[PDB]
Design a binder for this molecule. Structure first.
Ligand SMILES: *[C@@]12=NC3=[C]C([C])=C([C])[C]=C3N([C][C]([O])[C]([O])[C]([O])[C]OP([O])([O])=O)C1=NC(=O)[N]C2=O
Ligand SMILES: *[C@@]12=NC3=[C]C([C])=C([C])[C]=C3N([C][C]([O])[C]([O])[C]([O])[C]OP([O])([O])=O)C1=NC(=O)[N]C2=O
Lengths: 133, 137
């Protein structure tokens, strides 16, 4: 039973609270801050996270074509998105649809990236990957 | 058959988020960084934003009780989820659902705030302010 019973108000607030911030000033664009939401999704504690590129969430069966695409996406310094196979701290798997935006200072330089992460269904993942031509 | 699930909506909802960063170390906690999404939604250019407390988005029909709760949260270094009525640069209004995330330095002082903002519906706003007040009883 799912059809009537969707709580879009909690869903939306949850949406706002799963994120990381990265610092492309630093080498390999590490995560430097992370939300509690992100902790709960991934299962990793802060100490295992900050200082790294969140490509650590990737693993064996992650699509490299997709990874390639999103790195290409981020390269000019702009706002793109992607769905990727991601591994929890316990090795379990989940689809991660996430959206990356650049933060800019008074010089119009990208100081930081912010990324909101959304766990999504196999069905969703099929869809978004099928639409690749 | 009937294809789809909740995660499709969640995905759509997270795609509507945009971001700012403020600096409470500075006077009056001004915006210092912003994403393109924040400019589009509000209508202001980057130049017109950076350096201002983002209360400039507020106006005459903004719930003052809500604004004050925000101020309390900020003073205490707490996170805060809230829906406000904001005004674009052109005068038009919209409901702003946003999450304020406290950020600390190594001394454990608040040095930044991260803001995730979101345009939401009259129905959303209605329901949410309605869910408040009850909470106050
Ligand atoms: C990670 N989300 C995420 C969040 C931000 C703000 C940024 C800038 C990147 C991501 N990534 C992508 C990752 O860091 C990396 O850019 C890609 O792997 C492609 O580049 P490489 O160097 O590996 O070729 C995220 N990747 C994820 O797997 N999950 C996320 O949530
Ligand atoms: C502004 N969003 C927003 C984002 C962050 C990260 C922070 C710290 C604050 C906000 N505000 C609140 C506003 O700046 C101000 O701090 C409050 O009004 C506090 O009370 P006072 O009485 O000092 O004004 C935002 N307010 C909005 O209206 N819209 C935003 O997007």
């Amino acid at each position: 039973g799912a059809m009537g019973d969707f709580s879009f108000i909690k869903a939306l607030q949850t949406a706002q609270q799963n994120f990381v911030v990265t610092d492309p000033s630093l080498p390999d664009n590490p995560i430097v801050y992370a939300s509690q939401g992100f902790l709960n999704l991934t299962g990793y504690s802060l100490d295992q996270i900050l200082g790294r590129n969140c490509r650590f969430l990737q693993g064996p069966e992650t699509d490299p074509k997709a990874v390639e695409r999103i790195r290409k996406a981020i390269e000019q310094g702009n706002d793109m998105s992607v769905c990727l196979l991601n591994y929890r701290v316990d090795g379990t798997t989940f689809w991660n649809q996430f959206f990356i935006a650049a933060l800019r200072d008074a010089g119009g330089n990208v100081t930081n990236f912010v990324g909101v992460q959304c766990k999504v269904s196999d069905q969703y993942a099929a869809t978004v990957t099928k639409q690749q031509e």
